Write a protein that binds this DNA or RNA. Structure first.
Ligand code: MG
Ligand code: MG
Ligand code: MG
Ligand code: MG
Ligand code: MG
Ligand code: MG
Ligand code: MG
Ligand code: MG
Ligand code: MG
Ligand code: MG
Ligand code: MG
Ligand code: MG
Ligand code: MG
Ligand code: MG
Ligand code: MG
Ligand code: MG
Ligand code: MG
Ligand code: MG
Ligand code: MG
Ligand code: MG
Ligand code: MG
Ligand code: MG
Ligand code: MG
Ligand code: MG
Ligand code: MG
Ligand code: MG
Ligand code: MG
Ligand code: MG
Ligand code: MG
Ligand code: MG
Ligand code: MG
Ligand code: MG
Ligand code: MG
Ligand code: MG
Ligand code: MG
Ligand code: MG
Ligand code: MG
Ligand code: MG
Ligand code: MG
Ligand code: MG
Ligand code: MG
Ligand code: MG
Ligand code: MG
Ligand code: MG
Ligand code: MG
Ligand code: MG
Ligand code: MG
Ligand code: MG
Ligand code: MG
Ligand code: MG
Ligand code: MG
Ligand code: MG
Ligand code: MG
Ligand code: MG
Ligand code: MG
Ligand code: MG
Ligand code: MG
Ligand code: MG
Ligand code: MG
Ligand code: MG
Ligand code: MG
Ligand code: MG
Ligand code: MG
Ligand code: MG
Ligand code: MG
Ligand code: MG
Ligand code: MG
Ligand code: MG
Ligand code: MG
Ligand code: MG
Ligand code: MG
Ligand code: MG
Ligand code: MG
Ligand code: MG
Ligand code: MG
Ligand code: MG
Ligand code: MG
Ligand code: MG
Ligand code: MG
Ligand code: MG
Ligand code: MG
Ligand code: MG
Ligand code: MG
Ligand code: MG
Ligand code: MG
Ligand code: MG
Ligand code: MG
Ligand code: MG
Ligand code: MG
Ligand code: MG
Ligand code: MG
Ligand code: MG
Ligand code: MG
Ligand code: MG
Ligand code: MG
Length: 248
RNA sequence: GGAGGUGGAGCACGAGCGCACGUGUUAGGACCCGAAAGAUGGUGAACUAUGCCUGGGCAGGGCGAAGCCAGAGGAAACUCUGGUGGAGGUCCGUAGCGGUCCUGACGUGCGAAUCGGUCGUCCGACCUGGGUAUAGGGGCGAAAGACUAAUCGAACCAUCUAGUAGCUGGUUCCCUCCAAAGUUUCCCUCAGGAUAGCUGGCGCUCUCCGCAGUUUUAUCCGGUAAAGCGAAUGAUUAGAGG
RNA sequence: AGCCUUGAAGCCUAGGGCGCGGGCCCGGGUGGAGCCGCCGCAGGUGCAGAUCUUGGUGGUAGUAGCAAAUAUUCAAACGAGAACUUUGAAGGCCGAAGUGGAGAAGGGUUCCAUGUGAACAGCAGUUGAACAUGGGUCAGUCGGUCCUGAGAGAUGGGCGAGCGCCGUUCCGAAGGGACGGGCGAUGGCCUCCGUUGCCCUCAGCCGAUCGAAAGGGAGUCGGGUUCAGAUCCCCGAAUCCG
RNA sequence: AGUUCUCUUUUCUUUGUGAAGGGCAGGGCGCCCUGGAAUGGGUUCGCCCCGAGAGAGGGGCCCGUGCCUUGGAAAGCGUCGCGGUUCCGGCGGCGUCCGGUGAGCUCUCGCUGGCCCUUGAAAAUCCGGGGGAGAGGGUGUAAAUCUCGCGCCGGGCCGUACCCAUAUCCGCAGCAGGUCUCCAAGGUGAACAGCCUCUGGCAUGUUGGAACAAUGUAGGUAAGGGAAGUCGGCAAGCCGGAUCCGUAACUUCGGGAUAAGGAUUGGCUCUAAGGGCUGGCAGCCGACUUAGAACUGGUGCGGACCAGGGGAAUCCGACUGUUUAAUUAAAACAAAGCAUCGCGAAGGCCCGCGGCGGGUGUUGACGCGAUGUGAUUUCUGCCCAGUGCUCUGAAUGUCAAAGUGAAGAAAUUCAAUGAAGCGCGGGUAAACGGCGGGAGUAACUAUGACUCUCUUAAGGUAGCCAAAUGCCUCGUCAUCUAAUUAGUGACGCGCAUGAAUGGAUGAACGAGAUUCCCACUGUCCCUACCUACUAUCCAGCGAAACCACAGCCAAGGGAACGGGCUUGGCGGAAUCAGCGGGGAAAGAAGACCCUGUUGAGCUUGACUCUAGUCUGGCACGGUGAAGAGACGUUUUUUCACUGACCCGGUGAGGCGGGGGGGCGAGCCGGGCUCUCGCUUCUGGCGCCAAGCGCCCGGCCGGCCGGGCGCGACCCGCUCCGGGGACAGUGCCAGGUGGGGAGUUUGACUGGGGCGGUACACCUGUCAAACGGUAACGCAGGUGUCCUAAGGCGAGCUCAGGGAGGACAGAAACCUCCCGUGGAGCAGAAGGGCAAAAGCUCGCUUGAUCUUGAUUUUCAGUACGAAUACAGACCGUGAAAGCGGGGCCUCACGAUCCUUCUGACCUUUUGGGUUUUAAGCAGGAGGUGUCAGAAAAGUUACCACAGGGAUAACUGGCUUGUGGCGGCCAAGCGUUCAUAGCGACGUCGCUUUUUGAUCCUUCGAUGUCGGCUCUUCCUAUCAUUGUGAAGCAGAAUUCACCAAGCGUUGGAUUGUUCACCCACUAAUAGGGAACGUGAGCUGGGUUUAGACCGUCGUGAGACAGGUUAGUUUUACCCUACUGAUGAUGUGUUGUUGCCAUGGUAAUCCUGCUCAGUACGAGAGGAACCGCAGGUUCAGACAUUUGGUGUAUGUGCUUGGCUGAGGAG
């Protein structure tokens, strides 16, 4: 046989991200003395569309505490922030929408977005449009907090991780039918070469496990074991179940 | 050490070595030409496939979305009527792009895919220039095993390599003499081999008793032709007497 | 003690013969420089075939054909020669999405003048993009040149048997610069200002380099001029940069 | 300048001003000032704007490519006129003027809006601003400084011609192909449409002349009919613009829609309405529209060009989009929608030989990755047994290495322990997939709601159906026709329908498949004519394919279809235009089929491996506490540590500890519990130190200039965090691993496959009286069985029958007699056997050890089996003897390897001892394809070498089957065998049926049917001439001579075949390579795409359905059709004969005979005559029709010649 489309995606080539017109990487501030002890003020200059991303991005500007400079930060835009607004990042920032605080100081039930997976990494979790994480509980003795991720999983993270109060803007995006193959063509022309997708049963056996046959049938169980070799791991990968999810 | 059997490519008063010539069998390119293949290392994205970058391009019409204005109706909700407006992977249709049917032309062509009419689409998932990226068990594929320089169910180039072929084709002067087999057995044996047979050549040991695809005379062997079933086995017709 | 310029090989021959034959001998002609008999030795040693190889030639055959896109005619000139060249006049066509006027890519002298009519231009040619002999491309301002784009690609580092590869800011002491000030050395319009070396002080850019004759990118227009070049030459009038 | 016969103050051409600077129009402003607005106003085509400041005034700025001006009239151009060397930027006159208009086109600037789950580059480079370190001079010849105006110097390098495409480029070429752009006139018109013209360009596309045959290619027309043609309306045709009216079912309410269906359209002369500027009015300007009316022509008017046929339905796919460049444009692919699955980053998925490697990822679950289905609507039932997937695990069978323990001299052996994975138990079908059978039963019959029963993991639910899915099948009913294998609607025990392998539906849409209808028509009846380009002849110029020799037939035989050969017919130069019968014509070593110990693509439950991956061990690999152990050491568990190792961030910017200061708490002003480190209202600013303390320098306490410290706490060993003795990596070990590699996937065979085993053996027969002898010949058997069923001895006699005997009988047990085997001897059969070879007892292990010879198969090899002996040990018998397996003929296995047994055995390499190992000899472990490889599929994407050794056509032999025909005569025919039939039997013929066979062809003979066209046969349907009837007539049946002439139009189907409708004298049957593809067509079959059902895990398959799928060459020879001609008659001509060959006419209707013959009646003829027609043939154009480029004459559209006229 030949290498299947899934295998070919990992080699880069025509399968790399379309990053020509993106505005940069959306991150929190790099943690420094100001955010470790107090807070720093910043002003929202612009809220911009980022190609390939549902959520808008905020362009916040801070004062450099050591030099005569202005620092431009590219934050994830929490819903409700506006241009000209003051945002504050640090340990002693106040619990307002758009402020960046360590999750340790946030009370139980706080809604956050752009939450650091590890302390200092500048924000990794709950960055998709409309999403957020909640704060469940703190363990001051071990300095660790329990949060609920948008997928529903619960995670124990360091209390020192920073995060933005509120939910990511641009929510409810998936509530609109696309209605058109052309509109889906434009959605992915800004992201990557993944569209349109050709079904496995519609290929020949040479380039897919499901291909071939005088009838368009899978011919083998579609739940494939977790340890299947690359080029064989297609279909429902390591599925715990199949069918309609009935109930909770 | 003896006696008697038995296994040995032995002894029993050498015959070998060297060289040359012929024939036969083989190993090698191996009598000559002939595969589909496989391997190593390289050259191609000037066609085409797909992603990206930067440019260019797409008459004239039809329908008439939202929004807006006015008039009328209504207790309210709101309703009706006339305009305005100009949406759309919207319709007719040009450029462009494409290529349905004629199963038309042509079919040693104008052309190793073209030509005519007729046709699809023509603001979009649109068309296109150049730059750039992906390279051969690899790419790329809105998926036809398609496309990857007229080459694709695995490109092209050189080498391995005079690849192997139980299979097809060919195999070059004269005369003289002799002259087959398509059968036995074994073989993943059935288009082929090995094997015995049939052939030829070289002789040698003798001769001027032996032998014979023949009969005769003796003597055995046999269970087919025929015949038998009022004899065994098997099959079978009819009466008759108890 | 072979033959041979008093004519070798080769080649041709309705010449004379020999041999069962493979073949050979002699005569005649052409040719022009070598060759053969016998005893042995040696072999890349004998062709009718292989859709054999290479070269040549037939019949087919003066045959298929020289039929896509409406179309030519009259007079004259040159000339050996005119359906096809040139001029004049008619009749037509392309009909501004052109059969018009200019470019990019590609070509590379095909451009221009004169000459030829051998070969080529599938008839002809007095003609041609053919052949021959000579010419022709002029810039601060039009492009390249510079920038970066998708991307390519060194060093540090890592990997690697190795040619090398990965990687492009990532495991790097990655700056050879600057207003100013201080110490000397020199000079010149030696007056006082330069230059230089060292020291002091200050210093993010964080990625070498490459990447577009359509992207970014200061600044040239009018008139004349050649056989062929001109926003380039000349005339006139301007402008940018240093 | 053109026209001027007439008219035209006419028609044509032409009628400038660059950059840069200045000035001004014009356009724009989300810019300012006054002011304060509802009776809200302003305002655009639309919008939109206002107390966050509208209207109204007055300003400011930006672009000004427009006009004036400097340039600049000197130049350029038009015209007229002079010179010269006359190849002069030659010289002069005049001119280069004044207005209008526009949804006009092209460009450009600007304003404002809509679209995006799309937001639409970077950098070089240039500029402004904030700040104020600094510098500049002391009142002047002023200084630093200047983005102001002039002036001075320089700008190197490379490209630059021309073509830019029916001839400069790529396709071998001056190739009808391909190849990126810019400018873009008048008329008609909606128009960058088509048609004509100006500017500019060209010479008809690599030749001309003359003809006007056939056949073509491309255009036209056609009376009457109108799809009857054909697989199919393919092709052509009808419709078409615009105005006005009008418009259904259905619908997702958007559509359908130009639905459908009508009317109108010219020319000319008018009327009305629709605006601008200036000073309810007056004046002057103007640009195209719309509507209405009269008049008018032979009803012709969208007059050319341009330009939708329509309707009713069914299937499929929602749509737009895409696709096999070069045979498939589709129902296939995609799609939005829907539903699953993995993953929280030390991660999922993937790449990579390699790493602190790489893509997703400039990412973070509203995401990325992997699948299925395929808009909407409605719904998506049951099954977890199978195969997958997944979850739990020391509770826990198997389980590698390593480690631990015991035995031993050690090698080694043994035990204990027990990772993953398998087993075990759950979940899961929008995972692959699946979703029964029999019988009885309701008061006629039929069904059978109901019941019984066997049964699976469910037993097919809602739906739907002879559907693209149903064999039977052309299902049945209805509708559509005259007639329908077609279509539609129903029915449904459905070979083999069915629910995201998605079921049912349904608007719009479709170069998708199908049916009907209206309209239209040359598709057809049934063909004709016309035009252009060929063909044709000529001048010039000029190939190629192909070729053993060649080129007339009949039959024969023959490699079974001859050009050659045999026997006959016969034969006459050289050629022209056509033609497609033949050359089993050319083209290409057949793609079908088979064989090959030849392949390749693909699959998997094939064999052997393998990357990756999961898992255990060892090493890197450390520190401390406890807990549990064992004997201060050491194994293990847990918790911690950091320093290896890893990850994240940062321009490695404030870390740890202490000091110092502020707010609270509290014990009796000080200590502590212990917290804090100065920024949260506003879309400002924020650095390059102020201040203080202490030192030093220069000049004359005063001026000038520096240094240090605090401000800005001190000390520290990892920059700061997060992990961490684990990740991870190196090397081993176990599992998984069609992701990937290599390879295999028997043979025989009346082709192969499927089926059988005729593959190793045995009996009888074949088999032809020695032996041997074949077939997928016939009838059978074998892969075992036996401690006795082997061995010996003795003693008996069996099957069957007859006759007797309590229960007792057909059959129990006892007795007598007969009994040649008719029984038994493991088994198949054949042979053999009677004091035995059978049966019963007694003793036993000759079924033991051993060397040779021989026989059978045979090669005179092996094995296997068997025969005689020989040497030992034995058994049995009194003994002679018999016995080393079975009464004989079958009952089985090499090398290599392993295992056992044997010897005071040999070797174990320098010697010795000992374990081990290897030798020698004899058994066993097995090769059944049985003289003995280790082995699954598919190919329709296919490949090579071959095969006519071998299948799919024709042809050949045969003729069972099919067809046709005789003979006998039981019967039938009321009677009567034979008018006409004819059983039981039997003899033939034919090769238009199917078989059987495999002779020819696999370096190719084009495979069904139709169409067209000719010919032949007779086994005769019709017609002519006849014979016989159970022949009265009429009608019919049987038979003869007989193939001259006929044998038709249609619906359904690809059809052959069939069925029906209709007409007819009749509607016979056949052959010619199942006549006929260089004759066509291509509907079917029979490539590659795709759908459904059944089958398969799958790739894939299906004499199962469905849809789309390239049809090449003649100019050669012959034959044929026509055309010149040739011999030889001295030449030549006119008129003729006819040898030979061809040959043709055919059937029916009406009237009369005649309502007659005949007949009871009903009905009902014939011959002769007359008048017509059908089919066919040969002509012809007077007539009617068709054509018509006489391009003949009118009409007429657009354009062009200034108009008229003429064109
Ligand atoms: Mg496919
Ligand atoms: Mg596969
Ligand atoms: Mg020999
Ligand atoms: Mg040899
Ligand atoms: Mg191989
Ligand atoms: Mg390219
Ligand atoms: Mg459209
Ligand atoms: Mg359209
Ligand atoms: Mg054709
Ligand atoms: Mg042709
Ligand atoms: Mg695209
Ligand atoms: Mg790769
Ligand atoms: Mg396929
Ligand atoms: Mg060879
Ligand atoms: Mg070879
Ligand atoms: Mg063979
Ligand atoms: Mg064998
Ligand atoms: Mg052979
Ligand atoms: Mg016998
Ligand atoms: Mg007999
Ligand atoms: Mg001769
Ligand atoms: Mg010489
Ligand atoms: Mg030699
Ligand atoms: Mg030769
Ligand atoms: Mg000719
Ligand atoms: Mg031509
Ligand atoms: Mg041009
Ligand atoms: Mg030109
Ligand atoms: Mg020529
Ligand atoms: Mg020239
Ligand atoms: Mg590199
Ligand atoms: Mg550069
Ligand atoms: Mg450039
Ligand atoms: Mg440029
Ligand atoms: Mg105002
Ligand atoms: Mg002048
Ligand atoms: Mg300032
Ligand atoms: Mg040029
Ligand atoms: Mg012409
Ligand atoms: Mg010409
Ligand atoms: Mg040409
Ligand atoms: Mg007609
Ligand atoms: Mg008519
Ligand atoms: Mg019909
Ligand atoms: Mg018909
Ligand atoms: Mg048609
Ligand atoms: Mg309709
Ligand atoms: Mg579709
Ligand atoms: Mg595509
Ligand atoms: Mg194709
Ligand atoms: Mg096509
Ligand atoms: Mg699924
Ligand atoms: Mg279901
Ligand atoms: Mg299960
Ligand atoms: Mg089923
Ligand atoms: Mg049902
Ligand atoms: Mg239906
Ligand atoms: Mg039906
Ligand atoms: Mg019909
Ligand atoms: Mg199904
Ligand atoms: Mg000629
Ligand atoms: Mg022949
Ligand atoms: Mg022929
Ligand atoms: Mg062949
Ligand atoms: Mg072949
Ligand atoms: Mg073989
Ligand atoms: Mg293979
Ligand atoms: Mg291969
Ligand atoms: Mg296996
Ligand atoms: Mg595998
Ligand atoms: Mg494989
Ligand atoms: Mg076979
Ligand atoms: Mg005999
Ligand atoms: Mg006895
Ligand atoms: Mg003995
Ligand atoms: Mg016995
Ligand atoms: Mg197939
Ligand atoms: Mg097949
Ligand atoms: Mg044969
Ligand atoms: Mg046959
Ligand atoms: Mg009778
Ligand atoms: Mg035979
Ligand atoms: Mg042949
Ligand atoms: Mg033929
Ligand atoms: Mg042929
Ligand atoms: Mg007859
Ligand atoms: Mg035939
Ligand atoms: Mg033929
Ligand atoms: Mg044909
Ligand atoms: Mg077909
Ligand atoms: Mg097919
Ligand atoms: Mg299945
Ligand atoms: Mg009477
Ligand atoms: Mg007439
Ligand atoms: Mg006129």
């Amino acid at each position: 046989g030949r290498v299947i489309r899934g295998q070919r995606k990992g080699a880069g080539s025509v399968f790399r991200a379309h990053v020509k017109h993106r505005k940069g990487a959306a991150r929190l501030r790099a943690v420094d003395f100001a955010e470790r002890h107090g807070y720093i003020k910043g002003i929202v200059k612009d809220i911009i569309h980022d190609p390939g991303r549902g959520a808008p991005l905020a362009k916040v500007v801070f004062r450099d505490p050591y030099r005569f400079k202005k620092r431009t930060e590219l934050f994830i835009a929490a819903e409700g922030i506006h241009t000209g607004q003051f945002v504050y990042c640090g340990k002693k920032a106040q619990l307002n929408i758009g402020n960046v605080l360590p999750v340790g100081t946030m009370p139980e039930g706080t809604i956050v977005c752009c939450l650091e997976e590890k302390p200092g990494d500048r924000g990794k979790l709950a960055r998709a449009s409309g999403n957020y994480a909640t704060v469940i509980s703190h363990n001051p003795e071990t300095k660790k907090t329990r949060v609920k991720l948008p997928s529903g999983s619960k995670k124990v993270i360091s209390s020192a991780n920073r995060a933005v109060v509120g939910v990511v803007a641009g929510g409810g995006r998936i509530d609109k039918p696309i209605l058109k193959a052309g509109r889906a063509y434009h959605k992915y022309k800004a992201k990557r070469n993944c569209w349109p997708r050709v079904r496995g049963v519609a290929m020949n056996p040479v380039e897919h496990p499901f291909g071939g046959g005088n009838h368009q049938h899978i011919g083998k169980p579609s739940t494939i074991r977790r340890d299947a070799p690359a080029g064989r791991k297609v279909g429902l990968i390591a599925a715990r179940r199949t069918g309609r999810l009935r109930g909770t």
